[PDB]
């Protein structure tokens, strides 16, 4: 599997395992700096959604693949990442 940029994975469902994990991971990717601010501000967008053509979805859904790749580092194990909740009539009304 492969990502172009951690912004375009956090918007995708897939499947995080070790190789997702170390590719996600990387600092020409993201710089830690930058991972270290989502994964802080994950409390602050753990419940957001709505459309997804918005700034603050996408920065919720950089926080929440923060968060998941967190908990990857520390389980090990699989789990099916999805980006923040979303709908239909959320981006029809957006």
Do not use: W
Not at 7 to 36: G, H, I, W
Not at 58 to 64: D, F, I, N, Y
């Amino acid at each position: 599997g492969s990502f172009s940029t951690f912004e375009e994975a956090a918007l995708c469902t897939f499947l995080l395992n070790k190789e997702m994990y170390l590719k996600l991971r990387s600092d020409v990717l993201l710089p830690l700096t930058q991972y270290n601010r989502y994964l802080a501000l994950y409390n602050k967008y753990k419940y957001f959604s709505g459309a997804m053509d918005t700034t603050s979805y996408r920065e919720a859904a950089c926080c929440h693949l923060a968060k998941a790749l967190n908990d990857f580092s520390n389980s090990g194990s699989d789990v099916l990442y999805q980006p923040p909740q979303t709908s239909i009539t959320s981006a029809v009304l957006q």
